[PDB]
Amino acid sequence: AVTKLHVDSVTFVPSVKSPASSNPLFLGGAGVRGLDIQGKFVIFTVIGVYLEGNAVPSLSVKWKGKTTEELTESIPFFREIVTGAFEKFIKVTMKLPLTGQQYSEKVTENCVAIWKQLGLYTDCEAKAVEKFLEIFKEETFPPGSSILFALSPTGSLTVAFSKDDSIPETGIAVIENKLLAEAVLESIIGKNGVSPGTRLSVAERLSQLMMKNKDEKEVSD
């Protein structure tokens, strides 16, 4: 069930080693981030989402048996993935050239308003966003380069970069803020996310994996 995925011209492998924990993570799903510009659907980035193996049995408790459609429309299901006490990893590969400032401002364009809406915006989050922006401030990402995000089980966000599809053995910096960490993944597969394709892909694959898990345990190690 955990096969590689070909999205646009990129190929996401079945498993990657987390630059933060060095633990293996399986390919949950992949898709593109694009938008209609003057009549043409322009693809900006190609995204892959990886999850920790223990996430399958964890999610199975409440979601085993749900169909792809049921999981795709489920706000609670994806919120459980985003806030789950397990590691998540995101590989964002550029198709179009993007500057670190453009990209970082795009990923965080809604989180502040969202946190204020929920009454959760504190100085900790303000500092986290500032740090996030500083990390990307002077970076440039040509087509083919990648931005890697590792979300720890407790909410720490590790940021790393790559010139291609390779995954570095360690990250660049870590932002210790659960809300910002979750916001990065939410911006992709959440209800207000930018990639319907990635959300659908994750739903489809997890629906199948949760009905297997038991005695197949394909996400072990």
How does this model look, in words?
The protein has two domains: 1-54 and 84-188, Chalcone isomerase; 55-83 and 189-212, 10k-s Protein, Hypothetical Protein A, Chain A, CATH 1.10.890.20. The chain has helices at residues 55-63, 68-73, 75-83, 100-107, 111-118, 123-136, 178-189, 196-210, 213-216; strands spanning 5-7, 10-12, 15-17, 24-37, 40-51, 88-94, 98-99, 140-141, 146-151, 156-162, 173-176. The protein is globular, with a radius of gyration of 17 Å. With 221 residues, the chain is α+β, with helices and mostly antiparallel strands. The protein starts with a strand and ends in a 5-residue tail after the last helix. Helix 1 (55-63) crosses helix 8 and helix 4 runs antiparallel to helix 6 (123-136). A hairpin with a 6-residue loop joins strand 3 (15-17) and strand 4.
Assess the beta-strand content as a share of residues: 25-35%
DSSP helix fraction: 25-40%
Coarse morphology: globular
Which fold does the CATH topology of the largest domain refer to? Answer: Chalcone isomerase
Summing up helix and strand content along with how strands pair, one would put the structural category as alpha+beta
Distance between the termini: 16 Å
